[PDB]
Design a protein around this ligand. Sequence first.
Ligand SMILES: C[C@H]1O[C@H](O[C@H]2[C@H](O)[C@@H](O)[C@@H](O[C@H]3[C@H](O)[C@@H](O)[C@@H](O)O[C@@H]3CO)O[C@@H]2CO)[C@H](O)[C@@H](O)[C@@H]1N[C@H]1C=C(CO)[C@@H](O)[C@H](O)[C@H]1O
Length: 890
Amino acid sequence: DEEKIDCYPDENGASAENCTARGCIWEASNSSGVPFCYFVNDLYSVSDVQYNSHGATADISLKSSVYANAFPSTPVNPLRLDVTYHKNEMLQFKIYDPNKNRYEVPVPLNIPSMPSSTPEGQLYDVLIKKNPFGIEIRRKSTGTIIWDSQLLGFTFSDMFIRISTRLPSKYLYGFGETEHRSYRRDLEWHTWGMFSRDQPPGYKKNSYGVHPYYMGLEEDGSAHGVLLLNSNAMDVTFQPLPALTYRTTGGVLDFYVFLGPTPELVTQQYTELIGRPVMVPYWSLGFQLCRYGYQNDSEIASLYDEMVAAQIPYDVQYSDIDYMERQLDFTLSPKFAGFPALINRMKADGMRVILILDPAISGNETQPYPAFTRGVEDDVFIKYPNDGDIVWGKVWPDFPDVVVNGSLDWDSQVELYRAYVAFPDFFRNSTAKWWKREIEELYNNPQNPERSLKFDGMWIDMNEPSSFVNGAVSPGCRDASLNHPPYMPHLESRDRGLSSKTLCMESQQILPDGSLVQHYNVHNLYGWSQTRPTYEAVQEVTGQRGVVITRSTFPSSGRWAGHWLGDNTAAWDQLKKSIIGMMEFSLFGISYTGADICGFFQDAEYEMCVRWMQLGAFYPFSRNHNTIGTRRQDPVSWDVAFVNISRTVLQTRYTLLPYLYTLMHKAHTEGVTVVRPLLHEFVSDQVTWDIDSQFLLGPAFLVSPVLERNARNVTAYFPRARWYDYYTGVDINARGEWKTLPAPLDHINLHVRGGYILPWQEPALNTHLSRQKFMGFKIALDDEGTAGGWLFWDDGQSIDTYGKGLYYLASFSASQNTMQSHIIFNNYITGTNPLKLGYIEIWGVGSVPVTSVSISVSGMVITPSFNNDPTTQVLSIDVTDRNISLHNFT
Ligand SMILES: C[C@H]1O[C@H](O[C@H]2[C@H](O)[C@@H](O)[C@@H](O[C@H]3[C@H](O)[C@@H](O)[C@@H](O)O[C@@H]3CO)O[C@@H]2CO)[C@H](O)[C@@H](O)[C@@H]1N[C@H]1C=C(CO)[C@@H](O)[C@H](O)[C@H]1O
């Protein structure tokens, strides 16, 4: 019943007779999922298999065209397969057309100069099996088979490619941006669309980015990863005979396989290929506020003052498109003048500001508008292929004189008001200068130095590329590269073709080299194409490292940006989904992510929002954002009870920051994960393979959120190790056990894994005041493991600090009743530049209050006063009275 490989996934025309017309068998079923049409025999035949020291290659040919000609596109013949043993832990196999040169995804990866696999170290082996044509990847370690495409269905036609594989288990994690219902994916007959579209998160709905990458767990605790470097419109299909099926619409099958043995190891190797996450500015680790519909310039300032009055910490203040004049890029609303004043005032207190940008530029404007005009001069806009005019979409920008009724039909609004806009082609060496310029002159206004906005980071959005008309504008598109492209993957609005909510597929773009591409192949690449330049733009203009949040992603996208999970709604299910989203994104190679706290779409409710601020207080990207007409949902818009709660939890986060920052350093340097599923640190425990309603920050910080309304308690899992409550210092004392811990409406549960030391620092009102206060230690000893730890210090904003010069790297270790410090490299904390070392806490020291050594060394040796409770292992040791800094301490 499984093993049935759906022969008719087509949008239209599945029928007994139409089914027979391919080499296929029609047989109804009463079981949900099973394909009425299925494969009984193959249509390609592998021929000249050959192996060598460094790879393998066979040839694939039709047999015969009688049936291959019967489905989607004109099949390609013959094909060719090249497997390559890059490293011992990594593979690639590609199936392509050796004759014609097919579209291949233009995103740089790093690969050993030549194949560096060694017969003794190589951890996997491959076999090109012959009947029917198959590919079998195996972990040499223990025979588990990683990939096995010796199933039927393999097709390969210009605009339709199918390949399948048995999964080595019933546990698979993560696919290209959408709203999964659990971390581990179902397998019980589910298809998923993958294609950049402006879709609020939804079940089986294709969303902002595309990520054809998964991690599979094996029989034993072993793990592997698989990437399909294809950017065409595709959908994947999970069958209960553990096995999935790709159906792309026309690249080549370029697969890369990774078999680090562990989840982290896998990710380290995936990111090693596509690139590791961007290092973020220390200030971005703080809390963030925004909304769609900040009315007046001053309604923001009103908010920023209300927030410092409540003493709720936060470093980043935004403004949505409201600050633009009629949603035009690079313009300042009348209603928002002396907004430039607000920026400068806030940053002066130590805050920072992030501004949104859309990609589409309006060209129906009457006044002068350099952005658009110089756009046309430098020729940076996306046109049709036969020289044809700009491909005109519509988005946010309003027409010039039109008077706007905020309440009109959303459709009516799009014809009467919204201007025609052009989409820049961000591949082009030209579009880079143009874009980078506009950004320059936003920062330093050539004409009105008083109207300069001094932003610190950019939020590129609406870049799928999203558009509020299907394709182009007035007459439409004209093409079959667009609608019904032989196979229309299982996307949202399938009936609308690929055109739906974006550019015409025939739209011409130009790659950096200079060759011509149509939007059809690079659509999923669009937002990605825009990411690096924007990143660079911010860097050049601000002279600092800065940060970029983008909506549309693609593998490697996270190399220059972070990501927020998009248009959630203020509903309870959406909290848990954010935990997933984050987790999945760590896999996808993007460390800096989160959801819109309290919920974008719709009005926030009180209790849900107390719970969400507590959860979100631990997103790496912690931002409270919100759609237009809704009521405001920020912390100082509820009541005294709320405010006070918000304060406490935010404080906690501003304490973890030195830890959260080093994680970010380690993910950037090592490939490791930041938001990390328990199962990454405790694989041998199968209970964790399924838990997705709680998560880790790094290895030692266990977050256990309350995700249900009335609930004021929670049941959370606690793997086999010591879990110290972060607040009290006491070990919970569960071990591979489920405990029900009390969870009052003011409290969120956090625990520190025994065997780790966490560097902390006193909570300020923003990271500027914070970095000045006292540095702490939390040594979470475990009878289960003594203690290990890391700290990395930086000016927190300079470009490539680690990579060239000024940083501080210290590993910490506690063997016997004593913690010792080893500075690996120091170059920013010097005698003159001191790091105040405040307190030193130690949890789990013993019920016997007897020390053999109570005094700390700096070179000299003091025996400062301490507090100790025998009941609770805590051993506190204040030191706010010494000249102790991280650079002279031992
Ligand atoms: C702010 C948001 O506006 C537009 O969102 C539209 C969505 O495209 C559609 O999904 C559509 O229906 C959704 C409903 O609005 C919503 O109530 C939900 O419950 O389900 C519906 C899905 O069927 O209507 C939406 C109109 O509001 C736009 O497409 C979307 O991309 C916009 N979000 C971005 C815009 C802003 C402002 O620049 C940013 O603040 C957001 O973060 C962006 O994500």
